[PDB]
Design an enzyme around this catalytic site. Structure first.
Site, short mmCIF file in Angstrom:
data_model
loop_
_atom_site.label_atom_id
_atom_site.label_comp_id
_atom_site.label_asym_id
_atom_site.label_seq_id
_atom_site.Cartn_x
_atom_site.Cartn_y
_atom_site.Cartn_z
N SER A 1 32.57 48.29 42.72
CA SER A 1 32.04 47.51 43.83
C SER A 1 33.03 47.51 44.98
CB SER A 1 31.73 46.07 43.39
OG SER A 1 30.64 46.03 42.49
N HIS B 1 30.90 45.07 32.07
CA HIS B 1 31.09 44.53 33.40
C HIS B 1 30.77 45.62 34.44
CE1 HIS B 1 32.94 41.01 31.54
NE2 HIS B 1 33.63 41.84 30.80
N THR B 2 29.54 45.62 34.94
CA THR B 2 29.04 46.77 35.69
C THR B 2 29.73 46.98 37.03
OG1 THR B 2 27.20 45.35 36.36
CG2 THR B 2 26.76 46.94 34.65
N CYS B 3 30.01 45.89 37.74
CA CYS B 3 30.67 45.95 39.05
C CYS B 3 32.06 46.58 38.95
CB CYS B 3 30.78 44.54 39.68
SG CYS B 3 29.20 43.75 40.15
N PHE B 4 32.62 46.66 37.74
CA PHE B 4 33.93 47.27 37.60
C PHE B 4 33.96 48.37 36.54
CE2 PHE B 4 33.93 42.96 38.99
CZ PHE B 4 34.84 42.90 40.03
#
Lengths: 78, 372
Positions: free
Chosen positions: B322, B343-346
């Site tokens: 992100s 943890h998709t954003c990271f």
């Protein structure tokens, strides 16, 4: 007092705090804050109806805790 | 099959013809942040689609390399569901289908479907690929092939089993009519599958017709204008009967390419944290599990941990989170009775130090299904 939801086609539900006085134009301004999308690049739909920037949530009979559907605009050949 | 694809493909390319009376270059100057609308105006304004057959010279703000970048970056927008032209085929799918309501979303939609057809035909003509996942019936519909019950299974397997049950059993107990509940923008409508449908009862004698009409409604009937416009643009560069030497699996390979993840490139560019190492045992079990899964599973794992099905154009070295670059990350967390966490954003996988390979494998698979 009141809350609505905006569902994107990218599997995201945005929460907004609004009131029935709010114009569609103003709802879109809140969306631009949370999402980066210029209001004129927003298409909001409720119950199969495109929402005009000038009218209000109250005008469209949008009750509390409603879900609107957001899309990005395509401009075509002009 | 791939063996037959190569034979047909070499034949296909040799039969494609560049007309002699077009310029020797098709030039585009573009800004990355407006790539969709600019490529659209440039390409949909030409008087003569055959000029698209020339060598592409493209500039943002090596030409074959900029052309590669263009195909990739434009695919991300053409296959962006935000515009309402395509939509996810289910809440738990990464595959796209045509949005039957694309017209309400944007009145110019047919012109954009025609454009996307043109770009797709243009990729293929130049031996390049677009980047994206469409549901399998899309390719069958390109070829004119009938869509059937079995085609439902790769999109919606529960509905497939539900209809297979009806086929194989007496459906009287179900009280079905040739009515169907259609949902658009949160609202439900009853639509007749055939004239007077809601007053025609599904019976052992007509249930085959019912199943077929449900399949047509699911995949075909509501997207014909959009599909037909796509095909107009797609056949403006490629003759249809030439295209039709390909079956639907081959057509997807020809257009959108492999559909799988390079486990090696994936592994050779991941980062481990909090104890884990390239040769640590839990990690070797992880990449062994990833090798053994099929494409659908490798893709769903990528989506689970990064939030998207798309591999970066230059592989996992250029993976983004992100906040700029963010290599794939596995870090030790929790305890072996735990399912892994993402943890998709990271681009981060929280992976318990399981004790056996088999246990990691079932726990990794289960976490993946359990996410939406």
């Amino acid at each position: 007092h009141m809350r609505i939801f905006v569902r994107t086609p990218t599997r995201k539900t945005i929460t907004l705090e609004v009131e029935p006085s709010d114009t569609i134009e103003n709802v879109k301004a809140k969306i631009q804050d949370k999402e980066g999308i210029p209001p004129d690049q927003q298409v909001l739909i409720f119950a199969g109806n495109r929402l005009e920037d000038g009218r209000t949530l109250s005008d469209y009979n949008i009750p509390k805790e409603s879900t609107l559907y957001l899309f990005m605009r395509l401009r075509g050949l002009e | 099959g791939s063996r037959e694809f190569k034979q047909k493909y070499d034949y296909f390319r040799k039969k494609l013809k560049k007309p002699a009376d077009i310029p020797n270059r098709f030039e585009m100057k573009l800004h990355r942040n407006n790539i969709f609308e600019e490529s659209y105006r440039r390409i949909m304004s030409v008087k003569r689609p055959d000029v698209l057959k020339a060598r592409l010279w493209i500039e943002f703000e090596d030409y074959g390399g900029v052309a590669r970048e263009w195909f990739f970056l434009l695919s991300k927008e053409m296959f962006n569901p935000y515009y309402g032209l395509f939509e996810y085929s289910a809440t738990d799918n990464y595959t796209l289908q045509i949005n039957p309501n694309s017209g309400l979303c944007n009145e110019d939609h047919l012109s954009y479907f025609t454009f996307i057809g043109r770009v797709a035909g243009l990729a293929v003509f130049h031996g390049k690929l677009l980047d994206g996942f469409f549901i399998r019936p899309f390719y069958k519909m390109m070829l004119g092939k009938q869509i059937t019950l079995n085609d439902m299974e790769s999109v919606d397997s529960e509905y497939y089993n539900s209809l297979k049950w009806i086929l194989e059993n007496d459906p009287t107990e179900l009280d079905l009519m040739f009515c169907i509940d259609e949902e658009n923008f949160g609202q439900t409508y009853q639509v007749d599958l055939k004239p007077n449908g809601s007053e025609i009862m599904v019976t052992n004698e007509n249930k085959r017709e019912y199943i077929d009409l449900v399949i047509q409604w699911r995949f075909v009937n509501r997207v014909q204008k959009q599909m037909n416009a796509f095909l107009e643009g797609f056949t403006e560069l490629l003759p249809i009967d030439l295209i039709k030497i390909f079956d639907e699996n081959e057509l997807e390979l020809l257009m959108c390419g492999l559909g799988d993840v390079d486990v090696n490139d994936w592994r050779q560019h991941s980062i481990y944290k909090n104890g884990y190492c390239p040769n640590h045992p839990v990690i070797q079990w992880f990449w062994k599990a990833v090798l053994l899964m099929d494409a659908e599973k490798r893709i769903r794992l990528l989506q689970f941990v990064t939030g998207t099905s798309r591999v970066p154009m230059n592989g996992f070295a250029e993976l983004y989170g992100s906040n700029g670059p963010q290599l794939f990350t596995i870090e030790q967390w929790g305890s072996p009775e735990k399912l892994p966490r993402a943890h998709t954003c990271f681009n981060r996988l929280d992976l318990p130090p399981y004790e056996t390979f088999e246990d990691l494998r079932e726990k990794l698979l289960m976490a993946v299904e359990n996410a939406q």
